[PDB]
């Protein structure tokens, strides 16, 4: 993909890493039943006031090598194209052609 889009994913993940802990504590606060109703309402208001890219939902998994969004595998972290290239070269441990 475009170098701009790769850097855009990087800067989108930077904010996620920067606000990872704040989101966790705030989420526990808003889901706390013992917490006061106005307290959890204000905490949720802050959560909706957080910067947009801080959410781990706007993150799109991309191939590490090519940056391709479509055809991604979590276990390997690469798009289907270069995944096949490296498996066939033998660079990917354990993985081989299957038949049954």
């Amino acid at each position: 993909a475009k170098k701009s889009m790769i850097n855009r994913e990087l800067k989108r993940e930077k904010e996620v890493a920067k606000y990872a802990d704040k989101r966790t504590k705030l989420k526990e606060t808003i889901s706390d039943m013992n917490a006061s109703d106005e307290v959890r309402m204000d905490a949720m208001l802050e959560l909706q006031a957080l910067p947009r890219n801080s959410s781990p939902v706007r993150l799109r998994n991309r191939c590490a090598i090519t940056g391709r969004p479509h055809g991604y595998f979590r276990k390997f972290g690469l798009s289907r194209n270069m995944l096949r290239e490296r498996v066939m070269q033998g660079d990917v441990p354990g993985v081989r052609k299957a038949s049954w």
Binding site: G77, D91, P93
Partner: protein, 205 residues
């Protein structure tokens, strides 16, 4: 485009993976990405010394990289001062010590990657493709390969229409699963485009 990778189809029957570690489903992706990064860095850096079989096996953080080259002397350096820099550069972009222990190819005419990269270098030196191909065939055959096939594909000699040429000597039986066929595919960036070089070296059973 109708042929299976000779290495890949033989990955479990007679060949072995050139990456021998184990990971957990979550750790495996980052191990693989770091592995590919190290491989591309090595293949760009040691582009002078003819390395062909960099193998990555990482036991519990510490890794044991094993590069096999036809010219270990140049890549090791004087008293071993280039190898230490390579060691620390590997360690910097991996986790913890990457012990790179370096093998030696005692027959560079039987390794497909060395043959392919030699033909590629000759092609980028504006050498006749037919002569480079025939020279590689002769070299491998008289060095003792039971068979060699070399395919040159692209705008050969500046030709506007790309074409595929190839020479075969010996057997090189691709469909035999136990055939011990080394295979390499490289590219020569000439002044008219990319010329693909494929080399099959069949060595036994």
């Amino acid at each position: 485009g109708q042929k299976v990778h000779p290495i890949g189809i033989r990955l479990g029957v007679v060949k072995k993976h050139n990456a021998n570690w184990y990971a957990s489903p979550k750790q495996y992706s980052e191990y693989l990405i770091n592995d590919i990064q190290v491989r591309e860095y090595l293949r760009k850096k040691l582009d002078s010394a003819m390395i062909s079989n960099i193998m990555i096996e990482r036991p519990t953080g510490a890794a044991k990289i094993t590069i096999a080259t036809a010219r270990p002397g140049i890549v090791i350096g004087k008293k071993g001062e280039d190898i230490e820099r390579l060691q620390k550069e590997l360690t910097k972009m991996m986790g913890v010590p990457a012990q790179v222990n370096i093998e030696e190819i005692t027959s560079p005419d039987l390794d497909a990657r060395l043959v392919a990269d030699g033909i590629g270098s000759q092609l980028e030196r504006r050498v006749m493709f037919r002569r480079a191909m025939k020279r590689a065939v002769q070299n491998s055959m008289r060095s003792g390969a039971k068979g060699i096939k070399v395919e040159l594909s692209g705008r050969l000699g500046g030709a506007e229409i790309a074409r595929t040429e190839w020479y075969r000597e010996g057997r090189v039986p691709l469909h035999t699963l136990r055939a011990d066929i080394d295979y390499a595919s490289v590219r020569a960036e000439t002044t008219y485009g990319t010329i693909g070089v494929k080399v099959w070296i069949f060595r036994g059973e």
